[PDB]
């Protein structure tokens, strides 16, 4: 359990394109996917500029804590796919010892400025001595669909990484009633070169 605080563990995260060939035939391409130990630490100050500032921003959230809820994920995104019959989606799954109502805020940022936010509310299901939360096939917002289209139409691969330098996603999972930060995940991106999607997961620390 890498992306895990004391109160919530994200066991699954995937962004995908599903193409319907015919009513019984689907092709799914994963752009990125995640699916106990101590992780390498990253000085959070090294990335504050890439994420929203002010009240409710990354610094404010980190300072409010708890410190063990904050993670940095470095994705290598797989863009090698055929881009009417398309569905762009994001699926995620979480586990907690606690029965909570959770809110998941996902902010897409450019040059550390918020462009779009998706906000989802999730209720618990009891499962094998714990509580499970699932965001199932959440539609990828149009901004992200547009972004992916523009990335793929770039003539060169180095151009994609250059654009991605200033594209980030901040995911904040909160207990709706208490406002406790259960998970806060900062996402940074490069394009995958080796033929698929990969990731490194880090813990965010004060220094």
């Amino acid at each position: 359990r890498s992306v895990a605080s004391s109160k919530l563990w994200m066991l699954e995260f995937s962004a995908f394109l599903e193409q319907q060939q015919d009513p019984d035939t689907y092709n799914k391409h994963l752009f990125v996917h995640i699916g106990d130990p101590y992780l390498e630490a990253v000085d959070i100050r090294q990335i504050y500029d890439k994420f929203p500032e002010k009240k409710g921003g990354l610094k404010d959230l980190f300072e409010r804590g708890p410190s063990n809820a904050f993670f940095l994920v470095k994705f290598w995104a797989d863009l090698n796919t055929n881009i009417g019959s398309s569905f762009y989606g994001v699926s995620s799954q979480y586990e907690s010892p606690e029965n909570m109502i959770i809110t998941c805020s996902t902010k897409v940022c450019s040059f550390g400025k918020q462009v779009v936010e998706k906000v989802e509310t999730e209720y618990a299901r009891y499962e094998n001595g714990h509580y499970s939360y699932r965001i199932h096939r959440s539609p990828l917002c149009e901004y992200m669909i547009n972004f992916i289209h523009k990335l793929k139409h770039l003539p060169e691969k180095y151009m994609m990484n250059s654009v991605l330098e200033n594209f980030t996603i901040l995911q904040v999972v909160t207990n709706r009633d208490t406002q406790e930060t259960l998970l806060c995940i900062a996402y940074v991106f490069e394009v995958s070169a080796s033929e698929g999607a990969q990731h490194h997961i880090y813990r965010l620390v004060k220094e």
């Binding site: 990253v42 594209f167 990969q198 490194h200």
Partner: protein, 40 residues
């Protein structure tokens, strides 16, 4: 101008002579883990 301009973001890389975006420190020049740019 607008920092969140999607067209401007891509134009800056496609047509560098007409780039009009904030200037940033590239990630590779930052104090980050050794394998941050080396995929598993």
């Amino acid at each position: 101008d607008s920092e969140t301009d999607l067209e401007a973001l891509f134009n800056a890389v496609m047509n560098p002579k007409t780039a009009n975006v904030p200037q940033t420190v590239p990630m590779r020049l930052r104090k980050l883990p050794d394998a941050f740019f080396k995929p598993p």
